[PDB]
Design brief:
2 copies of one chain form a homodimer.
Chain A lengths: L16 H6 L6 H5 L5 H7 L1 E7 L2 E11 L7 H11 L12
Antiparallel strand pairs in A: 1-2
PDB class: viral protein
Keywords: SARS, nucleocapsid, dimer, viral protein
Assembly: dimeric
Amino acid sequence: AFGRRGPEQTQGNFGDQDLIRQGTDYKHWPQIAQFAPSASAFFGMSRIGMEVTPSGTWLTYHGAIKLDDKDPQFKDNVILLNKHIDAYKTFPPTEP
Amino acid sequence: NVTQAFGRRGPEQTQGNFGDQDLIRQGTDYKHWPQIAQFAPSASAFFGMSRIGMEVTPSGTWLTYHGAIKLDDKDPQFKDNVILLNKHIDAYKTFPP
């Protein structure tokens, strides 16, 4: 969908092979998706910008979401997210 | 409204910078909100397209994100969409002191 995971600025870096294979069918997808911002939160929280490069006009965004560390699921949420962040570094190269 | 929910618009890295005085007062009731909202990623797009990190700092644990969404210049609505987004980006610079 958004291409191969990898280290480049134009690549996404999130997702292990199960999330890649299964997408929204992945057993822990709801537990991940809860951290995704609503449209209101995305435009309300983020630093939004616009840039014009040789490939077109881009709407840039960045920000940071504070995890609720009083949530009983906090420690497990952190483990789950960490599992997927830069997971590609762990992949067999013959993957897929 | 928007600023009670997501804090003041401003220049700092921890603050949001998007929305003019009408957007921030009206929120999702703002007349042009759906035309803006079309640009916000789905959960799948947010996790699939962004660069995601995790940072543990004195204030807490934060899921960081950044990315860029290509605007479709072939779309007939492109001209109006970029003018609208541009209006709201850093609009707080025009707010009186």
